[PDB]
Amino acid sequence: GAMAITSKKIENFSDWYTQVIVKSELIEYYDISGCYILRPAAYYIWECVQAFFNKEIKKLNVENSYFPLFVTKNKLEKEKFSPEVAWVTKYGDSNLPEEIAIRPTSETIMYSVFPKWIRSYRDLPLKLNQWNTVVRWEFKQPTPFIRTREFLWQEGHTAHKNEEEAVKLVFDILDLYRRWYEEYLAVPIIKGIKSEGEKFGGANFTSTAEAFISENGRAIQAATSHYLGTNFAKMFKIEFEDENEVKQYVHQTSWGCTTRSIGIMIMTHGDDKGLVLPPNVSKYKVVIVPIFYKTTDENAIHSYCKDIEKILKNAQINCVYDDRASYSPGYKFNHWELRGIPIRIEVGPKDLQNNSCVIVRRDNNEKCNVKKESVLLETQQMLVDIHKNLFLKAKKKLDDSIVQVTSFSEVMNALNKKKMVLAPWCEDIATEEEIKKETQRLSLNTTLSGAMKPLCIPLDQPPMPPNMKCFWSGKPAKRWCLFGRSY
Amino acid sequence: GAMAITSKKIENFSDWYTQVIVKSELIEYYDISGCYILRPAAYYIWECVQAFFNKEIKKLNVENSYFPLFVTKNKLEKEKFSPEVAWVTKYGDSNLPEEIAIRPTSETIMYSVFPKWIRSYRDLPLKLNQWNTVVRWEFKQPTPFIRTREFLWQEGHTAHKNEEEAVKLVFDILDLYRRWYEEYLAVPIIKGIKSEGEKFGGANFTSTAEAFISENGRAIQAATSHYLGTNFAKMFKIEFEDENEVKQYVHQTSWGCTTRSIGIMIMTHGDDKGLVLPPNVSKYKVVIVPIFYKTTDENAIHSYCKDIEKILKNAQINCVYDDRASYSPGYKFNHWELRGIPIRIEVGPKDLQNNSCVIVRRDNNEKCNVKKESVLLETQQMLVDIHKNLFLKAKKKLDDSIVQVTSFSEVMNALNKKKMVLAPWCEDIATEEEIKKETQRLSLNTTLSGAMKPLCIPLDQPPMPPNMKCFWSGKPAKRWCLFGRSY
Numbered sequence A, B: 001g002a003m004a005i006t007s008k009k010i011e012n013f014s015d016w017y018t019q020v021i022v023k024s025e026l027i028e029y030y031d032i033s034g035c036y037i038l039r040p041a042a043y044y045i046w047e048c049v050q051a052f053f054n055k056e057i058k059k060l061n062v063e064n065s066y067f068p069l070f071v072t073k074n075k076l077e078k079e080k081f082s083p084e085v086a087w088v089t090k091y092g093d094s095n096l097p098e099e100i101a102i103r104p105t106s107e108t109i110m111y112s113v114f115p116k117w118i119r120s121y122r123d124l125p126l127k128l129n130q131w132n133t134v135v136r137w138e139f140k141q142p143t144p145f146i147r148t149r150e151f152l153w154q155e156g157h158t159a160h161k162n163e164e165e166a167v168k169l170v171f172d173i174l175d176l177y178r179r180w181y182e183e184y185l186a187v188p189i190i191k192g193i194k195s196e197g198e199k200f201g202g203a204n205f206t207s208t209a210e211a212f213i214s215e216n217g218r219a220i221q222a223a224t225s226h227y228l229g230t231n232f233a234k235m236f237k238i239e240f241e242d243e244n245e246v247k248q249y250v251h252q253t254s255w256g257c258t259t260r261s262i263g264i265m266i267m268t269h270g271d272d273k274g275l276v277l278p279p280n281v282s283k284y285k286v287v288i289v290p291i292f293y294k295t296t297d298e299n300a301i302h303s304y305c306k307d308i309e310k311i312l313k314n315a316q317i318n319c320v321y322d323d324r325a326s327y328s329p330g331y332k333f334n335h336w337e338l339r340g341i342p343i344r345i346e347v348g349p350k351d352l353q354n355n356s357c358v359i360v361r362r363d364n365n366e367k368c369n370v371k372k373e374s375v376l377l378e379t380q381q382m383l384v385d386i387h388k389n390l391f392l393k394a395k396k397k398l399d400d401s402i403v404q405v406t407s408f409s410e411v412m413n414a415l416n417k418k419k420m421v422l423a424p425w426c427e428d429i430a431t432e433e434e435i436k437k438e439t440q441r442l443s444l445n446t447t448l449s450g451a452m453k454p455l456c457i458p459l460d461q462p463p464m465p466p467n468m469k470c471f472w473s474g475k476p477a478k479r480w481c482l483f484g485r486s487y
């Protein structure tokens, strides 16, 4: 009975995951499949990254707005997601006069009105962002945080007078996403360009951040930044009069990150005692647990712990003193380890008379004795050191998951050691499907598809030797590409 | 042509309103009726009040969460909004296996899972809040901000071990709503209790803040705080084991405020030059406009204005220097008056050599000469004074809209001078419909209904004389009640 996780992360990944997100109180399941309740501990992470991203995109002059949840068939025909689109058809027990659709993304909704806001070069750039939810009602297997039917995200859309400005903003955003994942979630990502078979519909190109879950060998797209060029401008007639009084199409970007980031964080840092949180996204940085070794007095210990609590709160470090008289210290240790609190301070009589206390890190369980008036400083530093540790332990694990190959015969082996492969590729779009269908075929060897897809063409390219040929088709290769199984 | 408003507020209210919200760039209309785009200037107000409310409800230990947008028929039967509920019935061109509903409110969605979170008195109180959007797909006439089919709001839900705690939280929330409207929107409200015909379905009682628009004589409900008692607990089986090991029902509250607050603010402070913003919800507190009286040099004036801009930004007062070479100073004055900026600073050559500048308040258009090194301080104070002025001018207008009456014969007259009436009332629910139907009948005398409804029973009650009888039914009266036309 007790608590904790009954599956080990390295042995039954999927069940370890569902156990962790339910018992850490991040998530509640719901009676519609693919929909989940975000309880306060998870919503707090989202609020944290929201504050960071809002502050960074105000420096780029992006402004927040809110657009409607619904779109008409009329405006949806200008883009001619068709099966992922949910249709509202009645109110109460009577039918609507015209059925309407719930947004899977806000391109058509927003660009239906862009033309009245953009008429001349004086109106550019236009830079909008929304924090909202979208609905993609697919019938594949959902995964909490990772792939859901309704999810929270941010979506930004910009319009510029030329291509250079737009592309610069695309890559500025992509580095903001790098920081979102590193400075707050302590998660390393790889920047790259999607192949033509995988880019956003209507984009000129799609840039992307990719993460990897090494325990089950799967890549996950972490965020995207599309250069749309003038494609949507042509569809929606977003013209402006330039400084030579010539009509031009705007050059557009759109970009998005979702609550999938939370999932990625859990899958990277979680362990067999459960959740591990980077301090910057944990509401409580410290939990103080008292220990009464049948002590002659509770109240010296109560007094001491609340002294430590006010030391910590005066310096704006939010913490909690678990003084519940009903539970034992061991119960409390596990209760807060499962909920991911980064630092635990224990005081017993032994520590009280040495004017000391025990500090325990949640990441490596290393315990340290520290004098009372030293605790604040040693807490601050150690919070910092926890982040770096999490990050670098994840960074190493990312680096050691990429096997460089030059022929298809090396590929299946690497996939079955739970790796991605970096391979020379001709980038012809037909080969994408072929590679998918062959890797799946040779996967006869755990609920998700064995196909390997192109994940991204890394921005950091290794040199392409002179006559190096494509690992799949034998044609002359153009670039190095990442392939792997994904979510 | 030019710009501005072609209708005066006191003569064609509804058209003045639509002109103001479109031309101040608060709102864009959409091709689905009753749905509106919140452009950045309006969304900024919402973000402001969001920050205030988040900080205040964290002091009450309310925690933010996110629940799904959809509910099943199954969970919707436990509450047996039926016509306001939109039904999703297909994805793409295929039908869903079971149709699902979009939330008009989250009671049934959240309380379907409350029972697994509340099992014992140790689990109470439970305090949740959501920032989200809801859909009420009615076929009455929509009004931007005021009554829409999709709107943004906050909804809080709490569960307590007894009635006293729950009721205390109800009225704590109601005073937070009072502060939201006063300290940020500079809008006075009246606190009261809804009559039994107007309270939330399933509530024990509904407390409410009401506002009044004196230019067209209409009350608007500004926010609500419901004491649900154990009604929803009985429906959803939210039981807990108390400290005497007896099974008890939780006592619940729910409470909400929407973007209707923005509308109320516009209707209170707007004038014939357009929008008037309280500084605390304006992104730009100050706009600096340069004036070149055919000056021998632009650049002394450019230098001076940017000096003033850095004085203002160093002290964290966000402002904008309108240096567009194309437009005249008069154009710029109207451009920023229409957009509601509270303070305008003008510099011409005359002012530059006196080392002075002109400060103009947006509320009363009063202009004042001020020395350069004095500007910061005189800006700060004047921002403050603008708020109080707006508030008290609105407060007076609220007070002078209530006529106290004792018989029905006085009522129609007061309604036609655009007043509310405070009347002695027996509070029998039947009379509600009767009073509605009679006032509408006698309204033959501008697109909205002439019926007068009970708005609220004020918390601030005048004394009820000994044998005072109900103004409608002649029965002995119980309390004083506000009645009027509403939105």
Ligand SMILES: Cc1cc(N2CC[C@@](C#N)(C3CC3)C2=O)cc(NC(=O)Cc2ccccc2)n1
Residues within 6 Å of the ligand: A034, A136, A137, A138, A139, A140, A141, A142, A143, A145, A146, A147, A148, A149, A151, A221, A222, A223, A224, A256, A257, A258, A259, A260
């Ligand atoms: C939670 C989450 C996230 C995301 N996506 C999309 C790509 C992206 C990135 N990068 C967004 C564009 C920015 C991302 O995170 C997508 C999703 N659901 C789905 O696709 C639908 C679905 C539902 C159930 C099963 C299978 C599929 N669910």
Ligand SMILES: Cc1cc(N2CC[C@@](C#N)(C3CC3)C2=O)cc(NC(=O)Cc2ccccc2)n1
Residues within 6 Å of the ligand: B034, B136, B137, B138, B139, B140, B141, B142, B143, B145, B146, B147, B148, B149, B151, B221, B222, B223, B224, B256, B257, B258, B259, B260
């Ligand atoms: C913008 C906004 C606000 C609010 N409501 C509700 C009461 C409340 C208060 N207090 C909320 C509970 C807190 C409020 O603000 C309600 C609405 N639409 C509607 O009723 C539906 C509708 C749509 C078109 C025409 C006529 C009616 N639209």
Ligand code: PRO
Residues within 6 Å of the ligand: A105, A106, A107, A154, A155, A156, A200, A224, A226, A254, A255, A256
């Ligand atoms: O869904 C996507 O991938 C793009 C980026 C956000 C809006 N549309």
Ligand code: PRO
Residues within 6 Å of the ligand: B105, B106, B107, B154, B155, B156, B200, B224, B226, B254, B255, B256
């Ligand atoms: O809609 C209402 O009036 C209540 C308060 C927020 C949730 N339900």
